[PDB]
Amino acid sequence: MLGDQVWKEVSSNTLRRPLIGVEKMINYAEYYQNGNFQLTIALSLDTNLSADKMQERLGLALWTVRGYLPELGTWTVGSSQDSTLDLDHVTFKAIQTVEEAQEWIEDTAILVDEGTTVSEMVDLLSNKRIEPVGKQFRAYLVSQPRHGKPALVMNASHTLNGHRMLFQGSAILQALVDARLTALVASSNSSREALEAVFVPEDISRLARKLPQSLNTAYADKFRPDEADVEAGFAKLGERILNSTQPTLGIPRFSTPSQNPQYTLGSANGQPLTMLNLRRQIGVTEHRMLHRAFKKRGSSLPSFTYACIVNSIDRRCKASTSEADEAPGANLVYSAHASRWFPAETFMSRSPVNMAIVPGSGYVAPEELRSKQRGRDLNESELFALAKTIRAKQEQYLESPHIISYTAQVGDDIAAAMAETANKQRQAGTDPYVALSENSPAICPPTLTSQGEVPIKNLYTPEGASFDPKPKQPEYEYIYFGEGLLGGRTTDASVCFALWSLAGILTLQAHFDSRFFDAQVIDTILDDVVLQLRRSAASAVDEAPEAKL
Numbered sequence: 001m002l003g004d005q006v007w008k009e010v011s012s013n014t015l016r017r018p019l020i021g022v023e024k025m026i027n028y029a030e031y032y033q034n035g036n037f038q039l040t041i042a043l044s045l046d047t048n049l050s051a052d053k054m055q056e057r058l059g060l061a062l063w064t065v066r067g068y069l070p071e072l073g074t075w076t077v078g079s080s081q082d083s084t085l086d087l088d089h090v091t092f093k094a095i096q097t098v099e100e101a102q103e104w105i106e107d108t109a110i111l112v113d114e115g116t117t118v119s120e121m122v123d124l125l126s127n128k129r130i131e132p133v134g135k136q137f138r139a140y141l142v143s144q145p146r147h148g149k150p151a152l153v154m155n156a157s158h159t160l161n162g163h164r165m166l167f168q169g170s171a172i173l174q175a176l177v178d179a180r181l182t183a184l185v186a187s188s189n190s191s192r193e194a195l196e197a198v199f200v201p202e203d204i205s206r207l208a209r210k211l212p213q214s215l216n217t218a219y220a221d222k223f224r225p226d227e228a229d230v231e232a233g234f235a236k237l238g239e240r241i242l243n244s245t246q247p248t249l250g251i252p253r254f255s256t257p258s259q260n261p262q263y264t265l266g267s268a269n270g271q272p273l274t275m276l277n278l279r280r281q282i283g284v285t286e287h288r289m290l291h292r293a294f295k296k297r298g299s300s301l302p303s304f305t306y307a308c309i310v311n312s313i314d315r316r317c318k319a320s321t322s323e324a325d326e327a328p329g330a331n332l333v334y335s336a337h338a339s340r341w342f343p344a345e346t347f348m349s350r351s352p353v354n355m356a357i358v359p360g361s362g363y364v365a366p367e368e369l370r371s372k373q374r375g376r377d378l379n380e381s382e383l384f385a386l387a388k389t390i391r392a393k394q395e396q397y398l399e400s401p402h403i404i405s406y407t408a409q410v411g412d413d414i415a416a417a418m419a420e421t422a423n424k425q426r427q428a429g430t431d432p433y434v435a436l437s438e439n440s441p442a443i444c445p446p447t448l449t450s451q452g453e454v455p456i457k458n459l460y461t462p463e464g465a466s467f468d469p470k471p472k473q474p475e476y477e478y479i480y481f482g483e484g485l486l487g488g489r490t491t492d493a494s495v496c497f498a499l500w501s502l503a504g505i506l507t508l509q510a511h512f513d514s515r516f517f518d519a520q521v522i523d524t525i526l527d528d529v530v531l532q533l534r535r536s537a538a539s540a541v542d543e544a545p546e547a548k549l
Ligand SMILES: [Cl-]
Pocket: 161, 162, 163, 164, 337, 354, 355, 356, 357
């Protein structure tokens, strides 16, 4: 009941709950750091729907999805009665009229102008903060690109989202070909007339049970921690604090931000697009081979990838926080998903946890990341040993959910310090990019978040959603997606590596602002990692050729 009681009726048709934990930290970063962490995901579509059909169905599709996913209509920036800005709560307004519903549809289901490509949309959206501040989700239909395939492009705040956006997208794609929606559009003069037929005023009593809750309240409710549980979480907090001070290798940022960034995605508003997502994609067949080859070594694709990132940063940058006479270690900065401790029902329809990230920490000792024989030039055996070390340290850091016992306190501390720092920087007239970088470490530690394939249905027909191969022989209206694109947003002076899979396609990418890092160096590290993955896999498969099947 802690989950229900937390959303309180605060006005006639408005629910409100406090933000708690990582979600509160994220909300403050999005406000004070120009949309830091915000997510853009494109689902690239093959479809025999005309652009015209998709355009006339999109708004009603989004409205239909909102009916069972009211999470799409939440809001996280408001005020109190005393004027003051409020970053500490999430609110939900239950829509009571057709006009209000139509307003929300037209603000949230965007038809992109003829010509703009999916890649251009991902670049544009990942290079700015969502507006108005507080808005949590927007869907863009790119139905008439001048080249490339059409796509559903979603832009979301990270405060209440993550993995969940793929399911939100899947629901929208299902609605676009739903037989009942198609009949509605066919029988109505307009979207507004259709809406007028099927509109039901939203009921805060029923919808409260479907709105997202903090991981922290789901944790309290499911695990009911006692004092020993709290003690175990406090120990994992001490670990993260100490690891953040130990000598570490990493990628050095510019001492001062670049005023003429030389790597951009073009220019919009007259200003360069400097938030970059450098990507390496691995196809379905090669992905399977990599996955099996590293299992044959007793390793895993995510941990071996981390080892290669750590080693390639070491070799390419030769940058550390320690002295020259002292080999550094590696501070591991990574995220973990709470599904490792919570059942799948935690992430479904009843009070779902829609942002389930817990910060992870670990420290590779100097003797574990360098070889006595080869120094930084680790051979394949040594990289597998480093992978196993990294994996073991993550497994011990994450062995228990009681980490969550301190994320509310850490979230409060980071949020308060961010607001106080931002107010001080404003009063001092600090340049905005200097302000986003001066508090960042001169050396960015190796930062990799790894995501297993999320099983999202790939085929949508009037009979529903299914898992199937790309249509060779369409029998009805259908939508199929065979590839995704991620645009992460990192506005502070850090480099974030992301490893993820969608539709069997493996993507390794780095996102960062080129005002703060040499993009050529990051590009070289990504190339090094892919080369090491392929060479180590080929050697593993040479010893065990069965791993090719
Ligand atoms: Cl998540």
